[PDB]
Amino acid sequence: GSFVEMVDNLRGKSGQGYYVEMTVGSPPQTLNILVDTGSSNFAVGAAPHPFLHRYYQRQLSSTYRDLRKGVYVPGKWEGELGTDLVSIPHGPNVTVRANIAAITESDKFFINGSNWEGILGLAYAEIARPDDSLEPFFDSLVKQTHVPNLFSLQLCGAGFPLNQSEVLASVGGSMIIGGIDHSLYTGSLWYTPIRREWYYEVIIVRVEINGQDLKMDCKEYNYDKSIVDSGTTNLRLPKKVFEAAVKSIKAASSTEKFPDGFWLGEQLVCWQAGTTPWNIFPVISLYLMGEVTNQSFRITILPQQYLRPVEDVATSQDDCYKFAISQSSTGTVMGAVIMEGFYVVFDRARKRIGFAVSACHVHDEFRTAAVEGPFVTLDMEDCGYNI
Numbered sequence: 480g481s482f483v484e485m486v487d488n489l490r491g492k493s494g495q496g497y498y499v500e501m502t503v504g505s506p507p508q509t510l511n512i513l514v515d516t517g518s519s520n521f522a523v524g525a526a527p528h529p530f531l532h533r534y535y536q537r538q539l540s541s542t543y544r545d546l547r548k549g550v551y552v553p554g555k556w557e558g559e560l561g562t563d564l565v566s567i568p569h570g571p572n573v574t575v576r577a578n579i580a581a582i583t584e585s586d587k588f589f590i591n592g593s594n595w596e597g598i599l600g601l602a603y604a605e606i607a608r609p610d611d612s613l614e615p616f617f618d619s620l621v622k623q624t625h626v627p628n629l630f631s632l633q634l635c636g637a638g639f640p641l642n643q644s645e646v647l648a649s650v651g652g653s654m655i656i657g658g659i660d661h662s663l664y665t666g667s668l669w670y671t672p673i674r675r676e677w678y679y680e681v682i683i684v685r686v687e688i689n690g691q692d693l694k695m696d697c698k699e700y701n702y703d704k705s706i707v708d709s710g711t712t713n714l715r716l717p718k719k720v721f722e723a724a725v726k727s728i729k730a731a732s733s734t735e736k737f738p739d740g741f742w743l744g745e746q747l748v749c750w751q752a753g754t755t756p757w758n759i760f761p762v763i764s765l766y767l768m769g770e771v772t773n774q775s776f777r778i779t780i781l782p783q784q785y786l787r788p789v790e791d792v793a794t795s796q797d798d799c800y801k802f803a804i805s806q807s808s809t810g811t812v813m814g815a816v817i818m819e820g821f822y823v824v825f826d827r828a829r830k831r832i833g834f835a836v837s838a839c840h841v842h843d844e845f846r847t848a849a850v851e852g853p854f855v856t857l858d859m860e861d862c863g864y865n866i
């Protein structure tokens with residue numbers, strides 16, 4: 480651990496997302512910002528809202544600069560573009576001038592109960608709004624300082640429900656800006672290439688449920704793209720993959736029958752305190768393209784990752800969960816479900832993403848999450864989808 484100042488600087492949980500503290504303006508205005516590798520805009524609440532107890536007040540910042548340009552993002556929010564000095568208290572010790580979308584209008588964006596007031600898009604300029612000319616925060620940070628072009632994330636799921644007070648006092652993980660902290664993982668780090676720089680796109684080449692090959696044309700796994708997104712709660716899979724995966728997961732866990740509502744992620748399932756039958760649920764392995772030709776590696780998660788802990792409607796002593804794997808019509812999304820099992824390194828400098836077993840992943844005495852390799856795999860480029 481060579482970045483102790485950034486270790487444990489995150490708070491939150493999968494369902495609400497994870498945020499880091501930041502400051503904007505002069506004098507500095509403190510705000511909690513959601514860490515989102517699935518977008519590329521730095522946007523903060525900049526006007527009163529029922530669900531916000533604080534917001535960015537441009538008129539109180541001497542360093543605020545108006546860009547005289549609006550921005551609309553369909554939930555959804557509308558705002559006014561500008562720039563200001565920004566810092567991350569528990570981050571690198573620098574201050575940078577970055578673009579800021581001051582949110583003045585929003586719909587279903589801010590969440591009552593949540594403790595965040597803005598969002599930090601860490602992806603590339605290609606997907607920034609209004610267009611790619613709006614330099615993302617990390618791009619500004621790297622251009623203005625000596626911080627290495629790389630960040631890593633350790634999202635820590637508690638393994639049980641966290642009430643209002645607990646989620647505010649608990650450590651939700653770490654975001655290491657400009658480096659890799661060895662205390663956040665065990666074993667080796669394995670890297671998969673960033674196919675293209677817009678979202679953090681990757682290529683999945685094989686999928687297994689308890690070692691059994693899902694056996695689909697690998698292109699299906701990346702239709703129409705596969706990305707790593709801290710801003711998504713679930714592990715989302717393309718419609719056809721979801722259907723096959725669910726069929727296989729039901730088959731593996733067939734000793735117990737669950738209602739359709741459970742598999743749709745709509746209703747929770749509960750078990751007497753401490754008796755969750757983790758062992759009847761299968762582990763899930765995603766093989767990713769390796770850095771070497773014809774070579775792949777796999778990341779394996781447990782039901783402790785894909786069954787999201789939720790508080791029982793009667794706040795009883797039962798341990799309850801919701802199925803956190805769902806379908807997508809926009810490709811595979813490796814959200815918090817996947818990320819909570821691993822320390823993820825976004826090596827922008829070498830256009831690659833690293834995975835290592837997380838020091839904080841939830842498991843039992845019989846199984847653990849894993850990152851293993853290498854495996855001989857052919858025609859992996861063919862697994863990538865082309866419009």
Ligand SMILES: COc1cccnc1N1C[C@H]2C(=O)N(C)C(=N)N[C@@]2(c2cc(-c3cccc(C#N)c3)cs2)C1
Nearest residue numbers: 493495496515517518520552606608708709710711712
């Ligand atoms: C390309 O997408 C964007 C362009 C410009 C501005 N915002 C964008 N977003 C898309 C949105 C989206 O659907 N995903 C999945 C995403 N990763 N980020 C966006 C948003 C994420 C959230 C949000 C809120 C609360 C918890 C979690 C949790 N966990 C995520 C609110 S908007 C921001």
